[PDB]
Write a protein that binds this ligand. Sequence first.
Ligand SMILES: [Mg+2]
Ligand SMILES: [Mg+2]
Ligand SMILES: [Mg+2]
Ligand SMILES: [Mg+2]
Ligand SMILES: [Mg+2]
Ligand SMILES: [Mg+2]
Ligand SMILES: [Mg+2]
Ligand SMILES: [Mg+2]
Length: 103
Amino acid sequence: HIKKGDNVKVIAGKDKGKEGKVIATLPKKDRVVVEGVNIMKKHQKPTQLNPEGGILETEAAIHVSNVQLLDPKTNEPTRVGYKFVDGKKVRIAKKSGEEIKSN
RNA sequence: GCUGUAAGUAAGCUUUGAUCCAGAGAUUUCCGAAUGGGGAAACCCAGCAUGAGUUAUGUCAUGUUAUCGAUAUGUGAAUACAUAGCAUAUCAGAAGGCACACCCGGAGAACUGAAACAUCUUAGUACCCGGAGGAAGAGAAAGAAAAUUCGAUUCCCUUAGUAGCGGCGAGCGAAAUGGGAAGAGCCCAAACCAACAAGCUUGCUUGUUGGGGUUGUAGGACACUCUAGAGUUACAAAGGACGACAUUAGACGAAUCAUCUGGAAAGAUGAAUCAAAGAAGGUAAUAAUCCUGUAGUCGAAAAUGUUGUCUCUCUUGAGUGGAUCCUGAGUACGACGGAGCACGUGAAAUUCCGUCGGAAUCUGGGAGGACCAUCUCCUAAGGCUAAAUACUCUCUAGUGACCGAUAGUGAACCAGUACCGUGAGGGAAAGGUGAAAAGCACCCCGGAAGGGGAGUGAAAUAGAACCUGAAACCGUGUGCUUACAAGUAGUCAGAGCCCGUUAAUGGGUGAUGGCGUGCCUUUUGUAGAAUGAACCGGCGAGUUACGAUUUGAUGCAAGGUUAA
RNA sequence: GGGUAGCGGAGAAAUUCCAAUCGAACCUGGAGAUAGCUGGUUCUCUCCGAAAUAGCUUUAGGGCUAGCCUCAAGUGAUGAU
RNA sequence: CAAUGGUAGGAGAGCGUUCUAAGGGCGUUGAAGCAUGAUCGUAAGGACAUGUGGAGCGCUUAGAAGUGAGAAUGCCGGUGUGAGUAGCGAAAGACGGGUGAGAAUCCCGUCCACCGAUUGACUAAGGUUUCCAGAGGAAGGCUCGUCCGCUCUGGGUUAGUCGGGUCCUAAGCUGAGGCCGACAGGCGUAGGCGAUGGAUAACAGGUUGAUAUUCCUGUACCACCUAUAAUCGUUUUAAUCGA
RNA sequence: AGAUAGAAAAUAGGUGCCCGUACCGCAAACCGACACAGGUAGUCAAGAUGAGAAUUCUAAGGUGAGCGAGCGAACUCUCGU
RNA sequence: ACUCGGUGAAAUCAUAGUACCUGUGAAGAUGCAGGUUACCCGCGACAGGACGGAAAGACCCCGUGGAGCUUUACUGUAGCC
Ligand SMILES: [Mg+2]
Ligand SMILES: [Mg+2]
Ligand SMILES: [Mg+2]
Ligand SMILES: [Mg+2]
Ligand SMILES: [Mg+2]
Ligand SMILES: [Mg+2]
Ligand SMILES: [Mg+2]
Ligand SMILES: [Mg+2]
């Protein structure tokens, strides 16, 4: 499981071996949108809300099973564990020490 | 991160702990047993009290106001006391619902089987009603047995389709013994009574106050002499006070990278790793190592079942005589008429119900399948009682040589719904775009529906009626045929004309000759004008349980074999 | 506006009516009633291969033995001309 | 060397479909299905190649069965033929103008015709939104349709006096206590419910797209309450209160 | 019968609740599966002619019927001679 | 009814390139044998046949099939004495 703004690598899809920062989580479907991933080409029609339209290139969501956090020490793809610092479930990179998720 | 499904656009809420998830509490409109009166449920119309309002009236709010029960007081007829009867007050007393199950009663068919039918069978079944309880019924011997009693009850296996009952027909059909599950005995009347409340003159007596002891070795009072464990599941019956696991939220939880093909890999290839975890489900394809998990471990504020105790609350245990006394009455039991018991008013002894009769009190009474005499066993006519046992509307976890949308529930999808019927009721049809909605910006014809490009996508004969897309059926092309012919439409023989394979003594069409009246069912016999099918597709009929017989097979054999 | 309900009701009587067919309405349940009757019964080859007759039958288009098939043991000239 | 037609029927050997156990395999470098083909075995049937198809499925041995369809006037669903046939559901239309992509069929006008104890006006029962104004044209209208009882959007029903509730009761239905009843329940008194009846105070005109004894203008009437009263007068009788 | 010190009188102010109200109603909105030639209680109901609510034409007011255009054979149907 | 424009079913149906005569036959033939006749495809019409369609014979006979009814059939029975 990953966080709202951390930097992750992708291992599925046309995009692998590529980094990028997560921009949305949507935990009800476990699908995240990472920046520069799954670029989409959506045909938007000229309406009232949108004066004109075109082919927008927005990012689409991918299953959480396709992304991984990087070891903040060695940028090494890694899993994530936990430890009880003062009773708080804080995260660990599982190959090194503490991993920070502030934004 | 959120504001359900439900998309959206809008206003917002949230790290100050919200959102969510559990525990607990509060609000909980109207109808319905429906309960203030009425009523075509989800609506009308009130009495009373108290408050709001208005100068007042109209109006409104909140209690209350059904009927029964029981209890308690008032009052009290025809009538004199007194009773009906009235009139109040109180009380988590009763109502109604349901699990289409299970259980105990009351009532009780028929088609059917007997190759007819009446006895009998279906069957004490179905359907009705009345009670329940989570279980119920049954239960501590007037019981089997000729025993050496499993010493209460039930339930399982066998006895055994035996004994038996049967217009001795159809067909019904045990019980004991033995092997197991379960491991419970317990109180009241009766005698009698210290003391007392009431009629009696304390001589006799009444009582529910209470003790007393409840049983066949015959138990108990009696008279002696003697001595202070239980339990709320029967055995009286209430409830605080500490713990213990478990359950109605959860927490942690090992170990994988690279290339190849791809739209995407979990695949292939190579090299690793973990395993108390290679259950399972996801993930853009087939993952032990990506995710949710799994093995393992941990974890409750609370509100519950449960249980150890500590309290607590209850409280007499024997012997020996045996003179008297007591031990369940309109009862047993008999007669008549019925039911029940495997067994048909019959021997019905065993046992019940209606109608008449109607006993004994231990020096007694009942049973041992007409029966008696003797023997043996037991001690009725009062009561309570857990366990093994039956079932699943639910809830929790899981399983399946069970179904995969004409199946599996009727219902995978707003289904007991469309719809049908006045109503009881009856009751459908209907799942699948993609990985992601990326759901086709623009242009062109058209009023629009459509379409054709361009673009999205791996794919758009995946474009929303959307996966695959068969046949009947409808079209558009054409290679070869056909306008002198008599055709169950094929076969067999064959020229001509086109084509070229799963290359083999090849494929398509067919001038002309020979032979030739579909198929099923049913029949002595059917082209039959006997029957059945318009055509395609799907579904649609000797299976399963128990027992008997026979054959093959396999153990092993004067032995073989278990059932619960 | 109401009342009489199916072993019942109603009938100036026709077996007439009772929610479009009433010698006993409809709807459920016993219920998959029973049906000696008709119809249907689904893949292939190989081997053998009948009967439409007795006797008895509430029996005559049904059944039961017997005769006639088939399969497997056994018997071993018993069979036929 | 002999035998091999065959129905009721007996016997034997087998081919196929789903699932399971194990072993061994195939699969986006394209599975199952589907379609085609001139291929193989004695048959039930088995392969191979090429297209569509976009994920599962074969083979060996053995086990189990919802295992094989062409007929049951079988059931369900599709599609034929009859056939461009029958039918188009009582009737008088014509024409000018307009509207639109389109007009015998819609809007306006003129003429003509039909009803007129009614095809007219009301009002009940019943149906519930079909009512009105814009807009649309798939579907429904037995044709067409620019139209509508169709679809979309937004609207529309105003009461002291009208009809009910409120007041009364009939036929019936319920019925405390009560009578009778195997249970269930049936019957029934007092009392209630229940109009199709009895009793009850508003008329005219105007008014919009839709309402009007309802709204508004005019004028009224019936109940009820409050303030006031012009003197009714033992509050028994009264100005007068009454089951 | 009881009940009571009170309001009638000649005024002037106020208060009057719930339900139904659209629309069709001899009809394409109802009972007949249908925009069905059937059924659907009651009220008003004019003129000419007449005895009349008969009959023919018309007023008030509604309506021209949800398929048509041809040709005027057989044969049916309705009608006249 | 017929032609044209619009809309547009149904009963039925084993596949059908569906002739006549005389015969044969389950004894009354579009499908069989021997002859005779007949170019291919429509539209209006008639009804002889397809033992035409529709309804598992409104008659008849069987089923140890039902049902309703009758009586001095049997057995029983509410009720009455
Ligand atoms: Mg035939
Ligand atoms: Mg024929
Ligand atoms: Mg037929
Ligand atoms: Mg009668
Ligand atoms: Mg009749
Ligand atoms: Mg016929
Ligand atoms: Mg017949
Ligand atoms: Mg007849």
